[PDB]
């Protein structure tokens, strides 16, 4: 009873794989900052893995969660 | 070059340690969501290892990032 949004491909809620609790998110400006932001990754497939590498991140877990403000993935 | 909020106490905008980027947001809902929600974390201390699973987390880096909700006109 995780996140009803994208959480993998033809985004249409998923409701995760095994688990319960948290929706995790990452990335905002692809890397060529000169305005977009619709190249993302939102959902859950395990242990708020967390992650590492780039800019913004998030270990949501309050209902639904991640609709990329600007737009929306799909 | 980061953050101006809490982040190791009374806050003085500091802009924490060394490195170059960010300040680590973490926390909020005690474990008594018997209302409110205001005993946080949100400082800095090297490299947002990321952290753990208690509710609410992240890793901002957008200039600044943390002063927290509900509250009173200052």
Swiss-Prot record, chains A, B:
Record's subunit section: Monomer in solution, homodimer in crystal state.
Biological classification of the source: Eukaryota, Metazoa, Chordata, Craniata, Vertebrata
Name the UniProt record assigns to this protein: Alpha-bungarotoxin
Domain of life: Eukaryota
Reported function: Binds with high affinity to muscular (tested on Torpedo marmorata, Kd=0.4 nM) and neuronal (tested on chimeric alpha-7/CHRNA7, Kd=0.95 nM) nicotinic acetylcholine receptor (nAChR) and inhibits acetylcholine from binding to the receptor, thereby impairing neuromuscular and neuronal transmission. It also shows an activity on GABA(A) receptors. It antagonises GABA-activated currents with high potency when tested on primary hippocampal neurons.
GO cellular component: extracellular region
Main localization of the protein described in the UniProt heading: secreted
Other comment: Is identical to Alpha-bungarotoxin (A31) from B.candidus (AC Q7T3J2).
Subcellular location: Secreted
Keywords: Acetylcholine receptor inhibiting toxin, Disulfide bond, Ion channel impairing toxin, Neurotoxin, Postsynaptic neurotoxin, Secreted, Signal, Toxin
Source species: Bungarus multicinctus
